[PDB]
Structures are given as C-alpha cells and as structure tokens.
C-alpha cells in the first residue's frame, strides 16, 4: 500500500465518470463532496496487499492515526488514489481494504470522510505547508 | 526517483520558511507562484538516483513529456516534493537533477515553471479528474 498524507484546509471532489465496470454504488448527492481542516489520505492498494488485507488495513489505520494526532487533525478523509502506485491490487480487494481502513479510523474516534470508489474524480486541495503537512507511508504485509 | 503527475486547472504555491540549511536563494516575487492548465510534476529525488543523475533526469524528462503530450498539456510545473519517497538523495544532488528535468522539459518546447527548492511550502491544486489526469512513475538508474 502507498499512502500520501496531506494536511489540508479542505478537500473537495467531483465524480466525473465511472472508472470501473462496477464501481461502488452511490446516489446523486454523493457525486460531489467536501471536508474542511482535514488530513487527506490518498491511498493506492497494491497487489502485494492481497496477501493479507487485515494486516495492511490495521497498519494503515495505525500510521494514518499517528500522523493525524501529530498535526492535530480531527478530520481524516480516505481518498481512493489508485495511480499513486503501478502494481495495483484487484478492485474488489482494494475496495475491501479501503472499507476496513475507513471503519478502523472511525473506531479510533476521528471524524472520517471518504470519496466514492471506482470513479474518475476531480478534486481540489489546499496543503497547509507546515513541517508535517506532507508525508508518505508505504505499508505492506509482514513478508 | 518518484514522480506524481497531476493534470490540473491550476497550481498555486506559497513559500513558508526554509526547510534546509541552505535553500535556493529567492527574490520576493518567487515566494508565490501560479500556473494554469498545467501538468504538475511532484518530484522526489531518491538516494538510488545519485548513482546516475543524468540517466534518471533523461528518463524523467521523457516520461513527463510523453504524459503532457498524452493529456494535451503545453504547461508543465516542476514541484520539489521530497516526501513522495522515504529514501531521499542528498539535497545538492536533488537540486541538480530537479534543475536538469526543468531545463530538459523547456528544451522540448514546453512552457515550464518550477517552485523554489529547500522550503516548507503551502500549495493549492485542482486536478481535472479525467483519464490520465493522475499518474505516477518510479524511475531508477542502471
Ligand atoms: C481515476 C482517478 O481519478 C481516481 N482518483 C481513482 O484513483 N479511481 C480508482 C479508485 O476509485 C478505484 N481503485 C481501483 N483499484 C484501486 C486500487 N488498487 N487502489 C485504490 N483505488 C483503486 O477504482 C478507480 C479506478 O482505478
Ligand atoms: C517541505 C514541503 O512542504 C516541500 N513541498 C518540500 O518537499 N520541500 C523540500 C524540497 O524543496 C527540497 N528537497 C530536499 N530533498 C529533496 C529531494 N530528495 N527531492 C525533492 N526535493 C527535495 O528541500 C525541501 C525540504 O526537504
């Protein structure tokens, strides 16, 4: 898994078209979304993650949570970003892992948001630019 | 080298303060910048790249140019983004390679911009979200 964490003033997205044959079912009002003062977690689930979805998810939840705590981010946004890597995990498994990460962060007490899975999506973000506002994390199963 | 390419409506940046002991000298006007209808290339120069700066730079220029052509972009913006990777190359090497890429892209005839090297920087971007608007490349020398 490849994770790019961006502490932002906001994140705004706009669904433009389906990127998969069978994307995540959503309704019309979810075709646009936004979250303020948020740590955006751009995530690409990698093929190697299929080996152990649960372990990767738990570790992702831990790493993302640690950064949020550091920057005082109360809001976290899980953003499907497949092209952060080249070896992509299957969409069914990717979706599964992203759901687990979302569920895990919510359990940790954060106000978590997410963008629909399986779409071509436009987005606007404003990075605060502080010392820990831009961080990347590579998370893989215990090999 | 790690490269994140974002085809955007715009890229806007604001220098905060230095993140390295000796950053790229800058004038007041260089503290802020903006470019529109642009392919933004967030680049992280990695340790492995120190083995062959020219090679990595040449490949980066080629890859970036091919994408810009693919997405029909005439403007390209080189954005030093160290944290795209975990294994960073020396700053002196990172700066030289970033400068090589910037110039290589200009040589291709593109309208190219670049953000100052060595600073904590805030930025605003608007990704077009169309196909090919988000791509990444890992470039490693011989
Ligand atoms: C396209 C771009 O603008 C948009 N932002 C996008 O990335 N869309 C992705 C994710 O929503 C999801 N998806 C599929 N596979 C994966 C994966 N391995 N990891 C993460 N997401 C995936 O399916 C879409 C196409 O890959
Ligand atoms: C900090 C964040 O907001 C900002 N965006 C930033 O990344 N600043 C980086 C680059 O400008 C440059 N820099 C140092 N090493 C490298 C490297 N290996 N690759 C690219 N740039 C580097 O030095 C700064 C601190 O690492």
Residue numbers in the entry:
A (entry chain A): 1 to 143
B (entry chain B): 1 to 142
How did the manuscript describe this experimental structure?
We have been interested in a D-aminoacyl-tRNA deacylase (DTD) fold that is present across the domains of life in two different functional contexts: as an N-terminal editing domain (NTD) of archaeal ThrRS, which specifically removes non-cognate L-serine mischarged on tRNAThr, and as a freestanding ‘chiral proofreading' enzyme, which removes D-amino acids from tRNAs in bacteria and eukaryotes. Both share a striking structural and mechanistic similarity highlighting a common ancestry. Here we show, with the help of structural, biochemical and biophysical studies from three distant organisms, that the substrate specificity in this domain is determined by a differential remodelling of the catalytic centre at the RNA–protein interface rather than just the presence or absence of catalytic water as previously proposed. While demonstrating that the tRNA provides the catalytic group, we show that the side chains within the recognition site are dispensable for the proofreading function, suggesting a primordial mode of protein- or peptide scaffold-based enzymatic activity evolved alongside that of RNA.
On the other hand, the Lys to Met mutant, although showed partial activity against L-Ser-(Ec)tRNAThr in our earlier work, in subsequent studies with not only PabNTD K121M but also the corresponding K116M and K122M mutants of ApNTD and MjNTD with multiple batches of protein showed a severely compromised activity, suggesting a crucial role of this residue in enzyme function. However, a direct role of Lys in catalysis is still highly unlikely considering that this position is naturally occupied by a Met in the structural homologue DTD. We solved the crystal structure of K121M mutant of PabNTD and K116M mutant of ApNTD with L-Ser3AA and L-Thr3AA to investigate the structural basis of the observed loss of activity. A significant repositioning of the crucial catalytic water was observed upon mutation of the polar Lys side chain to the non-polar Met side chain, which is present in DTD. This provides a clear structural basis for the loss of function in this mutant, despite its high binding affinity for the substrate. Therefore, we show that Lys plays a crucial role in positioning the water molecule for catalysis rather than acting as a nucleophile.
